Amino acid sequence: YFQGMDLDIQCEEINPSRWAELLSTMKSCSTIRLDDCNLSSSNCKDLSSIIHTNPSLKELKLNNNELGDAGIEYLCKGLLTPSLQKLWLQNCNLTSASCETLRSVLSAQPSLTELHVGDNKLGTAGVKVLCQGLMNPNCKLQKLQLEYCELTADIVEALNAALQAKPTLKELSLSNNTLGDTAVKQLCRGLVEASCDLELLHLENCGITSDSCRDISAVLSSKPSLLDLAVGDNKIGDTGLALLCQGLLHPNCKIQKLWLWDCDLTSASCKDLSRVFSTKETLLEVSLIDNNLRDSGMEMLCQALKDPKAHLQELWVRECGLTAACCKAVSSVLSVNKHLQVLHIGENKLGNAGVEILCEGLLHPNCNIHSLWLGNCDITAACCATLANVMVTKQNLTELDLSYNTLEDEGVMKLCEAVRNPNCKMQQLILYDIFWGPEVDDELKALEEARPDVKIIS
Amino acid sequence: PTYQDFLRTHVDKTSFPNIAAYCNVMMVRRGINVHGRCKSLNTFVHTDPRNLNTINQPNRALRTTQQQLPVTDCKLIRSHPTCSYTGNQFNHRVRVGCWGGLPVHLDGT
């Protein structure tokens, strides 16, 4: 399929005649992406012309370029002159001064549905000005990213007022802003009062504790449209997790993606999480990375994942204090659960014995794991014959990450022999930062030519 | 792995507004996150490469700096719709693997 030309450049030096050449194209383009191309403010006067005359330009992505405030005022000269849908200006050295320009813009284009301005020191005052544009009836914005924008608690009344005026909003990210509990509670009330069918709410590293988890719960229970909640890197603990599960377990809640990484959860949280896993058929993806769940916690989740209502497809439990002790429990799940497709369980001392046990479950006919991540799991060469047999036998396993394991030349050679076998349907074998001699470096190169449908990443 | 691969993937300090932007951008700049891939874990060391070269050990040798150096540890939090990282900045022990008198492998924290 084709939908207009897609100009996409990243991490390059842009040269003026090439820039000249590329201009004629940009007049044709459906999307324009110039990511980290060391663009400066002077290039934006050109782009502003394109925005106005190109009836087909729908996406403009200029992240990681130092456009600065001056750049955005130039760039938007054309946007104040009418059909851009997506505008990304993440990490572009914008300050609060850009927000007046962006206020004008948001008030100008009903066509604009997505604005990404994360990683800019806009600050509370700046985003307050931005909200004034969001409040305009003309503004039909659907997605707003304000992560790492140096926002403080004082932003929330302005945002709430803007949300009330944004029934078209579907996605909101405020991650990595020091809001705190009082503010997040106020924000939750604002979202519940707003008519928007919010689909995604990201509040990672926002200063949230158990003190605002009842309020987040009320969002989950009042917004059936909410599919994606991220509150990782907030120290909510078992207490806050239990409060969140009141909303997760609410019959209105239709959560699909739940991100709870680095939330200071212990094994005790896995009681409540098990009840979610075995009750909420809509739940598809969960990250619990960097929580000290331990073997006992993992084992509770595994018992939950055997209930037929468990439709989880993706579980990340990297760095969760897991050992071989939990692997029989995990293997059991792979045996009977048909829905689980992705497991990340790296940075756990599973050892050779733990991983050999997982391979038992993997081989079961109704195991639908297609991607298994086992980086830094203390496995060595002794496990690789077992892994090899999995690779040639399990047709539906297409991705395996064994990075940061001391597999030794002997272990990797065993994996290679599996890759050569034609019954092997592996698509990406990932082997970062594994120390091998040059004879393996040469064998991988030779094997790239023998089986190009199997990518070996290092 | 070669010496210049080691440099490219594990030695940098480039200025970024925050650790997320640092990790997200540098993983791409250094040719690691390309073709849809997101490396789950990666550490960048901020020093003279000399400290790591300094000068000839048995190969496969593992050697550790005296002064613990500034490093950034990139950790993948989300792979879709695009790579998203967090990270930690650490004054840390830098352990390397040697080949041909050169550091060609980052082994340690």
Domains defined for chain A, CATH in brackets? 1-458 (3.80.10.10)
Q: Is any Cβ of chain A less than 8 angstroms from the Cβ of B94? A: no
Angle at CA of residue A319, ends A315 and A323, nearest 5°: 90
List the structure tokens of A160: 């709430």
Tokens of A144: 């707003």
Tell me whether residue B80 is one of the annotated catalytic residues. no
| Residue B20 sits at the chain A interface (C-beta within 8 Å) | yes
Contacting residues for A416 by C-beta, under 8 A, at least 6 apart: A440, A443, A444, A447
**Looking at the partner chain, which of A148, A403, A438 has a beta carbon nearest the beta carbon of B20?**
A148
A:283-302 residues touching chain B, CB 8 A cutoff: 287, 289
CB atoms within 10 A of CB B50: 8
Residues 6+ apart with CB under 8 A from A289: A232, A261, A262, A316, A317, A318, A319, A320, A344, B77
Q: Chain A within 8 Å of B92 (Cβ-Cβ)? A: no
Task: Quickly count: other Cβ atoms within 10 Å of residue B31's Cβ.
Answer: 11
Q: How many Cα atoms within 13 Å fall on the side-chain side of residue B32?
A: 27
Chain A residues whose CB is inside 8 A of the B77 CB are 204, 232, 259, 261, 287, 289
Q: Do B20 and A346 touch (CB under 8 A)?
A: no
E strand or H helix that includes residue B42 = strand B41-45
From A11, A91, A458, residue closest to B21, measured CB to CB: A91
- Contact at 8 Å (CB) between A273 and A238? no
Check the CA dihedral A225-A231-A236-A239 and report its sign.
positive
B45 labeled part of a ligand binding site: no
To probe the interface with A, which of B10, B29, B41 has the most A CB atoms within 10 Å?
B41
Probe site for chain A from B86, B107, B109 (most A CB atoms < 10 A) = B86
Residue with tokens 């544009």: A133
CB burial readout B71-88, b (16+ within 10 A) else e: bbbbbbbbbeeebbbbbe
* Residue B74 labelled as part of a binding site: yes
Cα–Cα distance, A208 to A96 (Å, whole number): 25
Active site residue B105: yes
Domain range for residue B22? 1-109
| Total domains present in chain B | 1
Which residue in chain B has the smallest CA separation from A289? B77
Q: B15 — phi, psi (to 5°)? A: -80, 125
Which residues in chain A have their CB less than 8 angstroms from residue B42's CB?
A: 432
For chain A, give the number of residues: 458
Q: How far is it, in rounded angstroms, from Cα A130 to Cα A103?
A: 5
Residue A64: its chain B contacts at CB < 8 A? 21, 25
Q: Does B61 touch chain A (CB under 8 A)?
A: no
Chain B residues closer than 8 Å to A435 by CB: 1, 60, 97, 105, 107
- Selecting from A36, A120, A147 the residue whose C-beta is nearest the C-beta of B29 gives A36
Minimal CA separation from B29 to chain A, in Å:
6
CA distance B104 to B85: 25
Q: If you search the block for the tokens 């909510």, which residue do you land on? A: A236
| CATH assignment of the domain containing B25 | 3.10.130.10
**Residue A80: how many other CB atoms lie within 10 Å:** 15
Contact between A229 and A263 under an 8 Å Cβ cutoff? The reply is: no
Q: How many CB atoms lie within 10 A of CB A227?
A: 19
CA separation for the pair A15, A33 (Å, rounded): 16
Q: Which of residues 156-215 of A touch B (CB under 8 A)?
A: 176, 204-205
Q: Is A405 on the interface with B (CB under 8 A)?
A: no
Cβ within 8 Å of B, A 52-91:
64, 91
User: Chain A contacts of B29, Cβ < 8 Å?
Assistant: 11, 36
* Cα–Cα distance for residue pair A5/A29, rounded to 1 Å: 5
Which of B:70-89 have CB within 8 Å of A?
A: 77-78, 86
Taking CB atoms and an 8 Å limit, are B86 and A10 in contact across chains? no
Q: Do B40 and A373 lie within an 8 Å CB cutoff?
A: yes
Query: Which resolution in angstroms does this entry have?
Result: 1.9
The two tokens of residue A199 are 């689909």
Per DSSP, A53 falls in state H
**Per DSSP, which regions of A352-447 are E strands?**
371-373, 399-401, 428-430
Residue ranges in B1-109 assigned as alpha helix (H): 3-10, 19-29, 49-53
> First and final CA of chain A: distance in angstroms?
32
CA B43 – CA B47 distance, rounded (Å): 13
- Sort B62 into a burial class: Cβ within 10 Å, 0-12 / 13-18 / 19+: middle
Contact A10 B28 (CB under 8 A): yes
Taking an 8 Å cut-off on Cβ atoms, the answer to whether B39 and A432 are in contact is yes
Query: Measured between CB atoms, does B41 come within 8 Å of chain A?
Result: yes
Picking from A328, A367, A372, A368, the residue whose alpha carbon sits closest to that of residue A346 is A372
Which H helix or E strand runs over A286?
Answer: strand A285-287
